[PDB]
Amino acid sequence: MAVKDALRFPPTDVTPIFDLFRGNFATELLAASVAHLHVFDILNESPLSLDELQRRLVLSERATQVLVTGLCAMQLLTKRAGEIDLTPLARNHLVTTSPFSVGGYISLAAQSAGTLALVERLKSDAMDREDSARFLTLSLAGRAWNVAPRFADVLPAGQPGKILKSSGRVLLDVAGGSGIYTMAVLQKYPTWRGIIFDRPEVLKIAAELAEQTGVRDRLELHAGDMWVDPFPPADDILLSNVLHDWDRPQCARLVAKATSGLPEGGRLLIHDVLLNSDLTGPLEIALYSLALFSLTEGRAYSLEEYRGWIAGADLKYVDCIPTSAHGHLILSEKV
Amino acid sequence: MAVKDALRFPPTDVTPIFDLFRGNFATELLAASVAHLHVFDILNESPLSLDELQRRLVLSERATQVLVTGLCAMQLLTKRAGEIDLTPLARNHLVTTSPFSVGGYISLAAQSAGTLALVERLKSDSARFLTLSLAGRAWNVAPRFADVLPAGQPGKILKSGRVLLDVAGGSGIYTMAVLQKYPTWRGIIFDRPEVLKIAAELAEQTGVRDRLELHAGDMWVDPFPPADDILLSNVLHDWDRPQCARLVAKATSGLPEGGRLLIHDVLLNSDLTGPLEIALYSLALFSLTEGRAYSLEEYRGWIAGADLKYVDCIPTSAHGHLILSEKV
Ligand SMILES: O=c1cc(-c2ccc(O)cc2)oc2cc(O)cc(O)c12
Numbered sequence: 297m298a299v300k301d302a303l304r305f306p307p308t309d310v311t312p313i314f315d316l317f318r319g320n321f322a323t324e325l326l327a328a329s330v331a332h333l334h335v336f337d338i339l340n341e342s343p344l345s346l347d348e349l350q351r352r353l354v355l356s357e358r359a360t361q362v363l364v365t366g367l368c369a370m371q372l373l374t375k376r377a378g379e380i381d382l383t384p385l386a387r388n389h390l391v392t393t394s395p396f397s398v399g400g401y402i403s404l405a406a407q408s409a410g411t412l413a414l415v416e417r418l419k420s421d422a423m424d425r426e427d428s429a430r431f432l433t434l435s436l437a438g439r440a441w442n443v444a445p446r447f448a449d450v451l452p453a454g455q456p457g458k459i460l461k462s463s464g465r466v467l468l469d470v471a472g473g474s475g476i477y478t479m480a481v482l483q484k485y486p487t488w489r490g491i492i493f494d495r496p497e498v499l500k501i502a503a504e505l506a507e508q509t510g511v512r513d514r515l516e517l518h519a520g521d522m523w524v525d526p527f528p529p530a531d532d533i534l535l536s537n538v539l540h541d542w543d544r545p546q547c548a549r550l551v552a553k554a555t556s557g558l559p560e561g562g563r564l565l566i567h568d569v570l571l572n573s574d575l576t577g578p579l580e581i582a583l584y585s586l587a588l589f590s591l592t593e594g595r596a597y598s599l600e601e602y603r604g605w606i607a608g609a610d611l612k613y614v615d616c617i618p619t620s621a622h623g624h625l626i627l628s629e630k631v
Numbered sequence: 632m633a634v635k636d637a638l639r640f641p642p643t644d645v646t647p648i649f650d651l652f653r654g655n656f657a658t659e660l661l662a663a664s665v666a667h668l669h670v671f672d673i674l675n676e677s678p679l680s681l682d683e684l685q686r687r688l689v690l691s692e693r694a695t696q697v698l699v700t701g702l703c704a705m706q707l708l709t710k711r712a713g714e715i716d717l718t719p720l721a722r723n724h725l726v727t728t729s730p731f732s733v734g735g736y737i738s739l740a741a742q743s744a745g746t747l748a749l750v751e752r753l754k755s756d757s758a759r760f761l762t763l764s765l766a767g768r769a770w771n772v773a774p775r776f777a778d779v780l781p782a783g784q785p786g787k788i789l790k791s792g793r794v795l796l797d798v799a800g801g802s803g804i805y806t807m808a809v810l811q812k813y814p815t816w817r818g819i820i821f822d823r824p825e826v827l828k829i830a831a832e833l834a835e836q837t838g839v840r841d842r843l844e845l846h847a848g849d850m851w852v853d854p855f856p857p858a859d860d861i862l863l864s865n866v867l868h869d870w871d872r873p874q875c876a877r878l879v880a881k882a883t884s885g886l887p888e889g890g891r892l893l894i895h896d897v898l899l900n901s902d903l904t905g906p907l908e909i910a911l912y913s914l915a916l917f918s919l920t921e922g923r924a925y926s927l928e929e930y931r932g933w934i935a936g937a938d939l940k941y942v943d944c945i946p947t948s949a950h951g952h953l954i955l956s957e958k959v
């Protein structure tokens with residue numbers, strides 16, 4: 297009887313709380329860059345290409361990108377013509393021989409557990425399994441309840457579906473456990489059907505929430521390994537906060553595999569945050585990217601980067617539509 | 632021969648770097664407040680007075696004020712006539728039973744070393760390296776400080792320039808800049824012997840060593856030397872309110888006619904609800920010292936309690952303010 301409403305917009309915008317919550321990564325990247333990696337003293341000598349800086353810092357491409365993007369977003373580095381240089385603000389205040397340096401003050405955090413953890417991550421690049429997966433899934437679910445109403449509101453209907461025998465569409469939600477985004481879409485589109493594809497420990501949460509939102513009869517839950525197990529037939533495939541967990545080659549692989557099974561007129565829906573096109577900001581996404589770098593194999597990506605993978609899978613890019621909490625729905629179509 | 636200039640303004644303003652650097656205290660205060668102290672679930676029951684909240688959270692007065700000030704500055708609590716309440720933003724997203732709660736996401740940081748340290752600090756409430764670390768802020772701010780310090784009256788101690796006594800503080804850089812601006816003045820740095828070694832070096836570099844004396848002592852119990860002006864720069868925020876009142880009284884007690892007490896510090900607004908940059912810095916001070924950031928009204932309370940006359944408040948840089956008071 298009672299039905300949880302997944303379409304009502306939240307009464308306030310939670311986004312500033314997420315932005316404040318990332319503040320530690322500003323402190324940690326500052327302390328890592330001043331006191332451990334010598335970034336500012338190195339670049340003060342001369343601007344360097346990204347490849348040159350990678351080499352001089354002895355860091356992976358990914359580690360160098362997230363470091364450079366973070367410091368650019370804090371207005372401390374600048375990107376020319378490819379080269380990376382200090383801004384006057386960094387040159388005057390974060391170079392050790394500047395009379396106005398405050399590097400010693402920043403270095404008061406050099407040995408904090410957070411700074412050391414981030415340095416180790418950069419350089420190296422009591423709960424059981426069920427409780428741990430539930431705890432993490434329910435923690436990310438709070439963001440989904442805030443964003444899924446927007447997401448469902450801005451998702452276009454698309455073509456009549458080709459899987460159900462005018463037909464609704466089948467929406468497959470890959471590694472989007474909680475499945476909340478799909479449940480909102482199914483409340484908006486009563487003729488559609490949804491499929492959540494994820495690990496079994498996560499599907500338990502989806503089963504509960506599908507009952508609460510009253511879409512259980514139009515939702516299937518499939519356990520599977522997204523890299524190797526076949527995706528079920530679907531009109532639309534959603535990758536929501538998935539691709540930023542993965543490094544570049546894995547992103548291209550996942551986009552290709554999802555695309556391979558789409559019918560003509562099927563859609564790949566990428567829902568994620570966006571760095572700007574030269575990976576210099578904005579600040580709140582650059583700090584969130586450091587969190588993703590610390591916890592996963594990926595980072596935040598730009599629209600241009602997503603469009604590279606889309607184009608490599610021979611999909612047609614359609615549109616980019618903001619949701620909330622810095623999310624963007626990138627729509628592409630199988631041709 | 633060579634003379635280090637202490638009067639040229641820096642070409643850029645370092646202040647935003649300090650603000651970015653305090654970001655960990657935003658994360659830690661959110662995770663402490665959601666996951667350990669249940670601040671929002673408690674206040675959702677009913678607005679509470681500061682004293683009521685201090686009892687419910689089982690915190691000291693000082694811990695409760697740095698917590699409440701931080702959350703007000705993040706637009707999560709509000710003060711309105713003396714009670715503390717949630718804002719809609721907090722009620723909607725930081726109360727656990729709200730359907731739009733993100734409390735579980737914030738709690739992903741609940742067991743970080745930084746969060747746990749702040750919780751322990753809240754609930755429980757070398758010098759060469761440290762002095763040389765704070766010296767960089769002073770090199771940025773001292774030019775502006777010297778620029779805005781008024782010359783005042785002819786001094787009473789030299790028999791005329793004024794004698795500026797710089798109590799604690801550290802490097803003595805602010806006094807060196809004043810001595811470059813006013814060649815007839817003299818300065819005294821009062822601090823621990825280890826700190827005075829740094830002042831001695833910097834006094835040679837800035838060419839004021841001959842007009843600068845280095846006095847070692849304990850500021851609470853040893854006699855201050857005679858001075859026209861006494862500077863407390865980034866000192867009072869290290870101390871709780873009774874110790875602030877004590878130190879202001881002791882400094883005031885030896886001022887002559889025309890003497891001045893110079894307080895150089897950051898300022899919270901008058902109802903201790905912000906601004907955010909100072910509220911996060913206040914959490915750092917709470918974590919490392921016995922004090923917190925204070926408001927102008929709080930400083931004026933101590934000034935008036937010592938029978939000084941409040942004169943003016945002049946911004947310097949890195950959020951500093953020079954609060955100028957006169958012996959009457
Ligand atoms: O895919 C994600 C995985 C995690 C994560 C978070 C904490 C852990 O101990 C392990 C993994 O956090 C996230 C946080 C986000 O805001 C977004 C994500 O996609 C993820």
Ligand SMILES: O=c1cc(-c2ccc(O)cc2)oc2cc(O)cc(O)c12
Nearest residue numbers: 404761765864865866868869919920
């Ligand atoms: O009086 C101060 C003491 C300290 C401090 C800093 C680090 C420690 O391990 C111990 C004390 O930091 C500060 C930082 C400031 O920005 C301002 C201060 O007055 C202080």
